[PDB]
Amino acid sequence: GQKLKQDGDSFRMKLNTQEIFDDWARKVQQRNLGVSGRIFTIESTRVR
Amino acid sequence: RKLVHDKELAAEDEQVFLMKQQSLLAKQ
């Protein structure tokens, strides 16, 4: 029983989930997504 | 004095309007 509970606790520790949430939030903050600016944008492209 | 149709609808090719408004966006 104690061996099984130790294995389950180790798996649950390996089954953590908040770290990816923190990483995603950090990436979101770093990239600084935004939409504010002009209504629509005009650009220059040399189409093939 | 039979009236003749005046200047018809102009084309104003898309590229010219696009460059004019690109300049306007740049200056605004």
The distance of A42 to chain B (nearest Cα, Å) reads 6
Residues followed by a gap in chain A, C→N > 2.5 Å: none
Pick from A45, A46, A35, A39: nearest CA to B28: A39
Residues followed by a gap in chain B, C→N > 2.5 Å: none
Which CB contacts under 8 angstroms, 24+ apart, belong to A41-45?
A: A42/B18, A42/B21, A42/B22, A42/B25, A44/B22
Rounded to an integer, what distance in angstroms lies between the CA atom of residue A44 and that of residue B15?
Answer: 11
Experimental technique of record: cryo-EM
Rounded to an integer, what distance in angstroms lies between the CA atom of residue A7 and that of residue A41?
Answer: 56
Residues 1-28 of B with CB under 8 A from A: 18, 21-22, 25
The distance of B3 to chain A (nearest Cα, Å) reads 43
Enter the resolution in angstroms.
5.0
Tell me the residue type at A43: E
Rounded (10°) CA dihedral B14, B18, B21, B25? 160
- B21 with A38: Cβ contact below 8 A: no
**What secondary structure letter does DSSP report for B7?**
S
> What tokens were used for A15?
């089954």
